[PDB]
Design a protein around this nucleic acid. Structure first.
Ligand SMILES: CN[C@@H]1[C@H](O)[C@H](NC)[C@H]2O[C@@]3(O)C(=O)C[C@@H](C)O[C@H]3O[C@@H]2[C@H]1O
Lengths: 153, 80, 141, 83, 136, 203
RNA sequence: CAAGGAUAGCACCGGUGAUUGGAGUUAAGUCGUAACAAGGUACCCCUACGAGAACGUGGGGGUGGAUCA
RNA sequence: AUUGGGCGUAAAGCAAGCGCAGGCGGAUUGAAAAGUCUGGUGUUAAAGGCAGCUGCUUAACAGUUGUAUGCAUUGGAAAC
RNA sequence: CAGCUAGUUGGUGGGGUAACGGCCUACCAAGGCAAUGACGUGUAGCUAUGCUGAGAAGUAGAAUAGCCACAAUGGGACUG
């Protein structure tokens, strides 16, 4: 419901008798209340690429859970050799992140979280790793049902 | 003095008359602020006895202050 | 009870049990066996009383000349092991010992670490209750 | 008059001179950076008071005394015989 | 790696050579001795004034000066500003920097010094290219 | 700048005002666009999170007539005590003398209050006050040094203003008392204070 | 005992110093086409000889070689 | 890169092997406790870091109230 | 920077220091330290700390405080 751009690039395939220049757009969609997703698109001009990216991201929409407005347990997410390290932020400290990570975390309806990036930063790979790490989230009810004890500790 | 210019300070400090100011010493008896004198001084009233009982009498400028506090009366008990 | 194809002790209790656990949860194997020892018995005891593990048995043929332990894993009808991750902190080349207030906690309290101070291994919450620190050996969650 | 001093336990290694020995002590202590208990061994020269006799390959406990000379700053105080 | 080889071979840090070691070395009389003071600016004397051609992506006619220093090493520098006041044999102020048109020229002759005057006009930039206040 | 001498330009560029709205009185065109000459169809060249964070920072700072280094000093002192620092920054900023002076209905603008205070026209705790950089404490009064009570501006603006709910005053004797801490929902503000908290990375 | 001097030559590190070596920097300099395709003798590695240069060849080794696969 | 990196094709696994020292090691029991865990005691100055308070119009500041790793002796624990 | 060292190493007697001691002396005897880095070379006042970093740590050790060092260079001694 925000649809802010992340990184737009010029790409071109080379073919006999001319190469085709086109625009590639990366988008991320989030209601700020739980439904999040991301997508890529390419087209000859802006409007077609934007529409394609919006449709692709809307199709891949999936929900996410909120733990006291924070990520209550540590997570080290990996995808394409780009480590993302996310840890809980105590409420009353604010949210810190870099641009792409800033947009990702604010778009998911997360209040605050402490983030760090290891490895060579790359937009699409970093987004994939962050989404894989966030979708890996656990929950106290999950550990309760997979354990014998029915309490958090 | 120590502390601040135009706002002096001198801690009541146990030391023997051998070295300079603000250096080696034995105990920290207390402190007096001359910037506001209303017959009051930070004194432990117990450790000063031990300091006096091992020689090293304090700086000469505090005798009236200790008499005001009431340390000389209980210190001269040894020579009684 | 019978198990041919004789097994071999890997190098030590903790590393062997942890690598067996990781390979089992990767291969969804029910039963995993290893060589018996007091430390491994204690580890199996704590990990089965903490609700992360299925039946565990210790057996011998006639003496301690051939004494082994074996254990199963807690699962679900949807083919998902109860455990999800493990990392050993103590290694044969390095053992770190920590005081009370330097006691680590996993996930945020969700995971259980295994700490032995003077009375065998135990859970983190009990060690903090007795305010005894000591050495950790592994994080499981 | 209480008489106390530092005491160290080591293993005697060699002897070539008269009523004097050289003892190797070992100490396993944490590395300053990686906290790995490394072993360091050190040589000390000691003399026999008269109630003792130095034999190579034995565990001894030595105490401080007046410095006899360079490296001679301990005497063989107590021997724990092999059992 | 492993703990034991760390014990026998502790890792050692690497440092990049400073982009101006000449601004850090000085000499003295009464003896010959090289010392390090890592100065931010020094004094020099120009011995050559001329021009040199730049590399591939740009072609121009810049002003470069060979400058000797009171210390040992003697080095090149680039003359900034419109025009110049450097003919030969003048004392001036040398400052660290880098210019990406010539090989090895990593020094700036900062104007507004004991001898060289500046681009009397440049009011947008007056901290550098020493000039007075904007005209009243 | 501590004394800008020109606030209408900032108001037009920022679309905000220290008062409710008095910086557009139809003296010519009443345009809510940016001042100067940059084209009435252009907005900016970079509009990232940095740009809006800076915009809100300048808005909040220029709403109080404070310099940036003193703002950083105030943030450093704020880091001492803990709680909800987002609203605590606002509470501490409003505790400055001129802010409460306006909240007392004494003078419409903080600049006017600073001019009054610096020239020695205010008394507090039987001590002359010449700066508004005073950390006000709960349970403190402020006198008016009755010699200077003859100022026409304060006399005229005492009744024609608005009194904040966290302060009281006996305006007949022109002396006010601090009641309690200010609140976010009682004062006119829409500033994203989180941007202010996050922007300053000096600490 | 003894600083210090004097003589004599041994060790170690520096400054300088005709004049040559090699390297880097320079907008399609000349030479020839060495390598990149089976680069027109398949390529490369170790070592030896020789010539303006590019390297050619001898002995051993590999495919990070083309067709047939 | 202990925290917190690698060694097939990008830098990097020695040409291979025998091995001194070092480092690391099968299971059960005992003993002490060499470290470790855990108390008491004395020692880690003052000033300074950090938290509260106080007088400087007020912040800057200064003073004060405490805090701070490590070391040795001493008693417990014996899982490693 | 592969071996350094000869009062260097140790016993006896004497002298001497404020005391203990090759600290010095007469005789006698020949090891000490080292690959876990002596020895040679280069550099350097150390410490509390300043600064940065969340931290493990890195950097410099200006004020200030404690210690030693020297007082044109090098040797001595009297004084107390
Ligand atoms: C030799 N005939 C070629 C052949 O048909 C090429 N397609 C395989 C064809 O390709 C084109 O049609 C193109 O798309 C672009 C142009 C460069 O050559 C054009 O004409 C190209 C024709 O000239």
């Amino acid at each position: 419901f925000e649809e802010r751009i992340v990184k737009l690039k010029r790409i071109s395939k080379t073919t006999k008798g001319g190469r085709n220049m086109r625009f590639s757009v990366l988008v991320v969609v989030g209601n700020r209340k739980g439904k999040i997703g991301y997508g890529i698109a390419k087209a000859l001009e802006v409007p077609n690429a934007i529409k394609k990216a919006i449709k692709a991201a809307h199709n891949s929409l999936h929900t996410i859970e909120i733990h006291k407005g924070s990520i209550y347990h540590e997570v080290i997410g990996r995808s394409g050799a780009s480590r993302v390290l996310l840890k809980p932020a105590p409420q009353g400290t604010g949210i810190i992140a870099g641009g792409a990570i800033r947009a990702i975390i604010e778009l998911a309806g997360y209040s605050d979280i402490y983030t760090k990036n290891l490895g060579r930063n790359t937009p699409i790979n970093m987004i994939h790793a962050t989404m894989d790490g966030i979708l890996k989230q656990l929950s106290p009810r999950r550990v309760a049902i997979l354990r014998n004890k029915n309490l958090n500790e | 003095r120590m502390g601040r210019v135009h706002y002096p300070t001198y801690r009541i400090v146990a030391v023997d008359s051998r070295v300079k100011r603000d250096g080696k010493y034995i105990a920290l008896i207390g402190h007096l602020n001359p910037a506001l004198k209303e017959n009051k001084c930070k004194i432990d009233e117990a450790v000063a006895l031990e300091w006096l009982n091992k020689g090293a009498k304090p700086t000469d400028t505090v005798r009236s202050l200790f008499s005001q506090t009431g340390l000389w009366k209980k210190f001269v008990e040894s020579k009684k | 009870i019978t198990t041919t194809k004789p097994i071999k002790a890997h190098f030590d209790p903790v590393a062997d049990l942890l690598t067996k656990i990781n390979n089992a949860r990767k291969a969804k194997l029910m039963t995993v066996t290893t060589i018996a020892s007091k430390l491994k018995i204690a580890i199996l005891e704590i990990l089965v009383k903490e609700g992360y593990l299925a039946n565990f048995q210790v057996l011998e043929n006639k003496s301690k000349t051939k004494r082994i332990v074996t254990f199963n894993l807690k699962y679900t009808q949807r083919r998902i092991p109860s455990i999800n991750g493990v990392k050993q902190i103590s290694k044969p080349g390095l053992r770190i010992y920590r005081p009370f207030e330097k006691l680590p906690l996993v996930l945020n309290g969700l995971g259980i670490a295994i700490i032995s101070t003077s009375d065998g291994v135990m859970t983190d919450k009990v060690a903090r209750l007795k305010k005894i620190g000591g050495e950790i050996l592994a994080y499981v969650w | 008059k209480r008489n106390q001093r530092k005491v160290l336990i080591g293993i005697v290694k060699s002897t070539k001179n008269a009523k004097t020995a050289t003892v190797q002590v070992e100490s396993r202590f944490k590395h300053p950076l990686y906290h790995k208990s490394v072993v360091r061994h050190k040589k000390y020269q000691a003399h026999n008071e008269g109630e003792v006799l130095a034999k190579d390959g034995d565990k001894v406990q030595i105490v401080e005394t007046r410095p006899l000379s360079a490296t001679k700053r301990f005497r063989i105080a107590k021997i724990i015989e092999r059992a | 790696a492993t703990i034991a080889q760390l014990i026998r071979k502790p890792r050692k840090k690497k440092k990049v050579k400073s982009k101006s070691p000449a601004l850090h070395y000085n000499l003295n009389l009464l003896n010959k001795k090289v010392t390090n003071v890592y100065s931010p600016l020094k004094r020099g004397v120009c011995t050559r004034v001329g021009t040199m051609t730049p590399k591939k992506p740009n072609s121009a006619l810049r002003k470069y000066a060979k400058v000797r220093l009171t210390n040992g090493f003697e080095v090149l520098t680039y003359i900034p500003g419109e025009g110049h006041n450097l003919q030969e044999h003048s004392v001036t102020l040398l400052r660290g920097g880098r210019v990406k048109d010539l090989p090895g020229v990593r020094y700036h002759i900062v104007r507004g010094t004991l001898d060289t005057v500046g681009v009397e006009k440049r009011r947008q930039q007056r901290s550098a290219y020493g000039a007075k206040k904007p005209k009243a | 700048m501590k004394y800008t001498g020109s606030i209408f330009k900032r108001s037009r560029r920022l679309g905000f005002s220290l008062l409710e709205n008095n910086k557009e009185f139809s003296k010519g065109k009443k345009r809510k666009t940016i001042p100067g000459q940059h084209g009435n169809r252009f907005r900016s060249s970079t509009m990232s999170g940095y740009a809006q964070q800076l915009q809100e920072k300048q808005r909040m700072q220029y709403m109080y007539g404070i310099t940036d280094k003193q703002f950083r000093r105030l943030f450093r002192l704020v880091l001492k005590q803990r709680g909800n620092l987002a609203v605590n920054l606002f509470r501490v900023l409003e505790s400055r003398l001129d802010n409460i002076v306006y909240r007392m209905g004494f003078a419409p603008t903080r600049r006017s209050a600073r001019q009054l205070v610096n020239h020695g026209h205010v008394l507090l705790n039987d001590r002359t006050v010449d700066t508004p950089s005073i950390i006000l404490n709960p349970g403190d009064k402020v006198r008016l040094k009755a010699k200077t009570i003859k100022i026409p501006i304060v006399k005229a603006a005492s009744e024609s203003g608005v009194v904040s709910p966290f302060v009281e005053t006996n305006n007949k004797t022109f002396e006010g008392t601090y009641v309690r801490f200010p609140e976010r929902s009682e004062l006119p503000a829409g500033i994203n204070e989180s941007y202010v908290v996050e922007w300053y990375k000096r600490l």
